[PDB]
Structure 1
Amino acid sequence: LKDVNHIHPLPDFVRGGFDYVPSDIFSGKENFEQTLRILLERLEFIDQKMVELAELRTTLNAEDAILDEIGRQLGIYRNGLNDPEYRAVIMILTGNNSKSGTRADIIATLKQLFGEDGVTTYKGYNYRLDINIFNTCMEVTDILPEIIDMLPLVTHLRVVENQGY
C-alpha cells in the first residue's frame, strides 16, 4: 500500500510552507508572495537533485562517466568495453560469486542477456556442452571471456549465434 523507498521528490513542496502563512494576512498582496516564492523555488531545484545524487549512483542507471568508479571498486576495469555491455560484464562477474555451474544455474545467468526464448543449451556425453543464441542485442566476442568463467573446470564448449530460430 506504500512504497518502502522513501527517497522521492517531496510532493507539492511549493504549496507547503505557504500553508504556514498565519491567517491569510499577506495572501492576495502580490508583493510578499513573490518574494517568498522566489526564495522557496530555489530549494525546489536542490531538493530535486538530491534524488539523482542517489538514484543515478545505482549500477542499473549509472552512466559510463561514473560507472567506471563502481567497476573500479570491484576490480572490473573498462578495458575496451563500451557502456551498454560494460554494464553486462559487471553484473555477470558479480553474480558468479554465488554460483555452482549447474545446468539449471547456467540457464539462469544466460537468461538476463538474451530475453526469455533467446538462448538454449544442448548437452553431450563426454563433457560436451553447447550454447545457442537467437536474439542477441550486444556483440558477443567481448562478452565471451566471462561466459567461460562460470562453467565447470572441465567443460568442453561450443558457441553458435544466429538471429531467430
Structure 2
Amino acid sequence: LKDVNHIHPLPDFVRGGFDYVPSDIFSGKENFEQTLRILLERLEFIDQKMVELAELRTTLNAEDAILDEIGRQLGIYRNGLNDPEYRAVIMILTGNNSKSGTRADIIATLKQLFGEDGVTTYKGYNYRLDINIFNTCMEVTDILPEIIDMLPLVTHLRVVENQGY
C-alpha cells in the first residue's frame, strides 16, 4: 500500500510552507508572495537533485562517466568495453560469486542477456556442452571471456549465434 523506498521528490513542496502563512494576512498582496516564492523555488531545484545524487549512482542507471568508479571498486576495468555491455559484464562477474555451474543455474545467467526464448543449451555425453543464441542485442565476442568463467573446470564448449530460430 506504500512504497518502502522513501527517497522521492517531496510532493507539492512549493504549496507547503505557504500553508504556514498565519491567517491569510499577506495572501492576495502580490508583493510578499513573489519574494517568498522566489526564495522557496530555489530549494525546489536542490531538492530535486538530491534524488539523482542517489538514484543515478545505482549500477542499473549509472552512466559510463561514473560507472567506471563502480567497476573500479570491484576490480572490473573498462578495457575496451562500451557502456551498454560494460554494464552486462559487471552484472555477470558479480553474479558468479554465488554459483555452482549447474544446468539449471547456467540457464538462469544466460536468461538476463537474451530474453526468455533467445537462448538454448544442448548437452553431450563426454563433457560436451553447446550454447545457442537467437536474439542477441549486443556483440558477443567481447562478452565471451566471461561466458567461459562460470562453467565447470572441465567443460567442452561450442558457441553458435544466429538471429531467430
State the TM-score bracket (shorter-chain normalisation): over 0.9
For structure 1, the residue ranges without an aligned partner over 5 or more in a row are none
Shift in Å, 1:53: 0.0
Task: List 4+ stretches of structure 1 deviating above 6 A.
Answer: none
> Matches of 2:20 and 2:86 in 1, distance apart?
50
In the superposition, the TM-score normalised over structure 1's length comes to 1.00
CA deviation string 1:16-73 (max 9, x = no partner): 0000000000000000000000000000000000000000000000000000000000
Shift in Å, 1:92: 0.0
CA deviation string 1:62-90 (max 9, x = no partner): 00000000000000000000000000000
Identical aligned residues as a percent = 100
- Partner residue in 2 for 1:52: 52
Aligned length: 165
CA deviation string 1:80-125 (max 9, x = no partner): 0000000000000000000000000000000000000000000000
2:78 counterpart SS class: coil
> Matches of 1:32 and 1:112 in 2, distance apart?
56
- Partner residue in 1 for 2:143: 143
> Matches of 2:84 and 2:61 in 1, distance apart?
11
Output the aligned Cα RMSD: 0.0
2:60 counterpart SS class: coil
In the superposition, the TM-score normalised over structure 2's length comes to 1.00
For structure 2, the residue ranges without an aligned partner over 5 or more in a row are none
2:96 counterpart SS class: helix
Residue 76 of structure 2 corresponds to residue 76 of structure 1:
yes
Shift in Å, 1:140: 0.0
Shift in Å, 1:162: 0.0
